[PDB]
Amino acid sequence: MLKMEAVPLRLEHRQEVIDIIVASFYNKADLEQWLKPGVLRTDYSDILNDIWNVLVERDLSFVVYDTNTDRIIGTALNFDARNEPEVDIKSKLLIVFEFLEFCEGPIRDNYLPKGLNQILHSFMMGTAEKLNPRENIACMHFMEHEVLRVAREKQFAGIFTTNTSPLTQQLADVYHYKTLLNFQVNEYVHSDGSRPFGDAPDEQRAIVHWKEV
Ligand SMILES: NCCC(=O)NCCc1cnc[nH]1
């Protein structure tokens, strides 16, 4: 059985976390696949490197170790939704985060509690490529169990996230997240009038989830 341990994010974890996040969102990503081409492996390392110190300082993120190998197999990058770093993303990933803000912004700032230390934004969650289905399913449950524990320990009012893959969306629903938006990603219009995910099927959703803790 997979034996896992959730360790808070340390500064030395940068390259291990970047590898996992690139693996989970490069050509495997449900939104990034439609921005092909022009999205390189380094675009997510660039974002993570720009926010790495603040991400570790906020002490809201953790990595998941396989205690049998003492290697990181998963990570949950979290921020206070009302206290996130300012990112000038100079890649095509700007459309992704502008789309996520398009999904989150209106709901966050109008229907979610006001003030800091209220909204725990589970904005990124990744697992290692080597994980087989069982290891991945088990690691996803472990990270969900831990973001709740971190949310309660850090005294947040609830967990807030936009789930962009069918697996994370289903996990959120069986974990009793409330659905606050079920948006069809091929209907989102970029600033230039185009639909960056217009080639995605109608069935691909960006679901904004929220569970009070
Ligand atoms: N509870 C899961 C949160 C998560 O990992 N969401 C990823 C959304 C995303 C896609 N591309 C950039 N961000």
- How many domains would you assign to the chain? 1
Q: What is the dihedral of CA 151, 175, 131, 208, to 10 degrees?
A: -80
120 CB within 6 A, ligand 1: no
Report helix, strand or coil for 69: coil
Give me the residue label for tokens 């960006």: 206
159 CB within 6 A, ligand 1: no
Cβ atoms of residues 6 and 78 within 8 Å: no
Distance 77 CA to ligand 1 centre (A): 10
The two counts, helices (H) then strands (E), for the chain are 5, 7
Return the structure tokens found at 32: 């990034």
- Please tell me the total number of residues recorded for the chain in this structure: 213
Please state, as a whole number, how many other Cβ atoms lie within 10 Å of the Cβ of residue 3. Answer: 10
Distance 191 CA to ligand 1 centre (A): 22
Cβ atoms of residues 160 and 122 within 8 Å: yes
169 CB within 6 A, ligand 1: no
Distance 192 CA to ligand 1 centre (A): 24
On the CB side of 133, CA atoms within 13 Å amount to 1
User: Amino acid identity of 66?
Assistant: D
45 CB within 6 A, ligand 1: no
**How was this entry determined?**
X-ray
Domain that holds residue 82: 1-213
Separation between Cα atoms, residue 163 and residue 206, nearest integer Å = 6
Separation between Cα atoms, residue 162 and residue 206, nearest integer Å = 6
- Cβ burial, residue 132 (10 Å; 0-12/13-18/19+): exposed
Please state, as a whole number, how many other Cβ atoms lie within 10 Å of the Cβ of residue 102. Answer: 17
Separation between Cα atoms, residue 86 and residue 28, nearest integer Å = 26
Q: Which atom of ligand 1 is nearest to the CA of 171?
A: 1
Return the structure tokens found at 57: 């300082």
Distance 125 CA to ligand 1 centre (A): 6
Distance 123 CA to ligand 1 centre (A): 5
Resolution (Å) of this entry = 2.5
21 CB within 6 A, ligand 1: no
Distance 66 CA to ligand 1 centre (A): 22
Separation between Cα atoms, residue 145 and residue 128, nearest integer Å = 18
127 CB within 6 A, ligand 1: no
Q: Say if strands 62-66 and 119-127 run parallel, antiparallel, or are unpaired.
A: unpaired
Strand runs labelled E in 99-140: 119-127
125 CB within 6 A, ligand 1: yes
Q: Residue ranges of the alpha helices (H) in 89-197? A: 93-111, 133-153, 166-174
